[PDB]
Ligand binder design. Structure first.
Ligand SMILES: CN(C)[C@@H]1C(=O)C(C(N)=O)=C(O)C2=C(O)c3c(cc4cccc(O)c4c3O)C[C@H]21
Lengths: 112, 112
């Protein structure tokens, strides 16, 4: 969604510490895989964008949801979220567990 | 811009540690209170979205840029960037200097 779309009620920013660019590419490919297609159809899901840090040491997911309740009761309650968490957090090359920060959009500066 | 617009070549995620929700509100209010009106017309600036962490301890900015070159040359190299930093650090309730992570969008999941 546009970053300041009013439908975006909740945002998760998840950071995965990796040992380098080869692992960053694998992590992204696995996360945006094809078998993660079910996420697209979860009620309340708006977007998940994976980024590689410029220094090769981290992959960051910025994800937009309609609400915290949608994220917790529709994605979190689904058995596939536990499956995906296991898979991503056990890929070889990870230097620690993913760290998530949950947050609400409160203001935005955009060009006119 | 849409999170997966291909024009987004460079992203900065800046985390401001704060002492609770009241400071969260005051910092977003400051950041969107006109101190950075000038940024809207900077070439290559796409957006700056400020969010309050749900735990009350940080304000996070997700900022989209057309390229790292536009960010460094049209933002970082402009003396007004430093004035903006100084304005945001002068607020009571900040608990440390802001932390930045620089990154490139590499994959996305959108709805359907
Ligand atoms: C490893 N998986 C990928 C991982 C793990 O471990 C944690 C965690 N253990 O704290 C986490 O919070 C994740 C998280 O919040 C995720 C995970 C993927 C994921 C995918 C799409 C949207 C979205 O919002 C989201 C997400 O929030 C990946 C998570």
């Amino acid at each position: 969604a546009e970053v300041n779309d009013p439908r975006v009620g909740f945002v998760a920013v998840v950071t995965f510490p990796v040992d380098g660019p080869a692992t960053q590419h694998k992590l992204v490919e696995l996360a945006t895989g094809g078998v993660q297609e079910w996420i697209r159809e979860v009620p309340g899901f708006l977007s998940a964008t994976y980024h590689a840090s410029t220094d090769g040491t981290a992959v960051v997911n910025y994800a937009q949801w309609e609400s915290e309740q949608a994220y917790r009761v529709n994605f979190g309650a689904d058995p596939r979220s536990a499956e995906l968490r296991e898979a991503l957090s056990s890929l070889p090359g990870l230097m620690g567990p993913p760290k998530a920060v949950f947050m609400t959009p409160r203001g935005a500066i955009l060009p006119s």
